[PDB]
Amino acid sequence: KEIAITHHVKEGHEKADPSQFELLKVLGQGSFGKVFLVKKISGSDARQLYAMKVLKKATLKVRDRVLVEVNHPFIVKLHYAFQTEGKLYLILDFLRGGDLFTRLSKEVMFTEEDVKFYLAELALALDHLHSLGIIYRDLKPENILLDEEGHIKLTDFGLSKEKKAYSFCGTVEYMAPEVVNRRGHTQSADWWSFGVLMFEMLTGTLPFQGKDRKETMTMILKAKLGMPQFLSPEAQSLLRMLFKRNPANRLGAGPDGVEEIKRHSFFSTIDWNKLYRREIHPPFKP
Ligand SMILES: C[C@@H]1O[C@@H](Oc2c(-c3ccc(O)c(O)c3)oc3cc(O)cc(O)c3c2=O)[C@H](O)[C@H](O)[C@H]1O
Ligand SMILES: [Mg+2]
């Protein structure tokens, strides 16, 4: 019922305040609502243009991550997040004409061909965040945006809808077993969530889902997955390899990380260089 934003800050982070920004424009951006276009006044990113959101009733959680940063084609970043007079200010990559991946998934039926495109961009994005020291934990469709051209933009910040408060409050359906049991986890937990995203894109349903959180948790830990037989052998194989309960056995967990996924037969048709250059067209345009 309330928005919680999670900001994964870098080591050299420079705290910001309202005074460090010049207001340029006020835009109405559909799903994004009222967006201020602002210009950074000082610091290393002086003169950079950003989107600013001002949230009336939101909580902010700031976390540490595990070179000057450059843009990645498939990520939007939260640059600054600060609270002033009961308000939360978010300074974000400007994403004009952007929209929600969830809006798309509700409107379309994804085929395996469609999903290969979206998951390939998402894999590049997720691996990049890992290289930056960000572990997602409960990567989910709410984290996935689309630019005006229809390409994936994964948010580098957490966003959820949140009795006692918790430092981490994730959506259980997307959580790996080792995350559910709070025994310790790594970037490999995110490849499980990646598999959950893939499963949901392909079937319109979640692979582990009970009546309550408690039941869903037990299913994630112990439930055998009923693999939909309409899926190709390649799709089936990828999902089985992502849904290994022991993270050590999970695809993407070895030293080569995301390469294990890029080399999987499910993605055999993807040219990863062309993809990164944004030279492959999306299945759906917003
Ligand atoms: C923090 C979010 O800001 C606004 O949406 C934006 C989002 C966003 C992200 C995840 C979601 O699940 C979602 O529903 C929206 O992301 C943005 C990213 C940017 O780089 C720039 C933006 O202006 C927004 C941007 O304006 C919306 O007002 C949304 O209600 C609010 O929760
Ligand atoms: Mg800040």
From Swiss-Prot:
A GO CC annotation given for this chain: nucleoplasm
Tissues expressing the protein: Intestine, thymus, lung, heart and brain.
Family the UniProt entry places it in: Belongs to the protein kinase superfamily. AGC Ser/Thr protein kinase family. S6 kinase subfamily.
Binding site residues for ATP: L27, G28, Q29, G30, S31, F32, G33, K34, V35, K53
Span of domain Protein kinase: 21-267
Species lineage: Eukaryota, Metazoa, Chordata, Craniata, Vertebrata
UniProt modification remark: Activated by phosphorylation at Ser-167 by PDPK1.
Gene, per the UniProt record: Rps6ka3
Gene disruption: observed consequences: Mice were born at expected Mendelian ratio but display decreased bone mass. Embryos and pups show a delay in mineralization of the skull with frontal, parietal, and interparietal bones of reduced size. Mice also display a significant reduction in long bone length at one month of age.
Complete-protein stretch covered: 48 to 346 of 740
Modified residues (Phosphoserine): S167
Subunit record text: Forms a complex with either MAPK1/ERK2 or MAPK3/ERK1 in quiescent cells. Transiently dissociates following mitogenic stimulation. Interacts with NFATC4, ETV1/ER81 and FGFR1.
Swiss-Prot/TrEMBL GO biological process terms: intracellular signal transduction; negative regulation of apoptotic process; positive regulation of transcription by RNA polymerase II; response to lipopolysaccharide; toll-like receptor signaling pathway
Subcellular location, record wording: Nucleus; Cytoplasm
Annotated consequence of substituting S167E: Loss of phosphorylation and activation by PDPK1
The name this protein goes by in its record: Ribosomal protein S6 kinase alpha-3
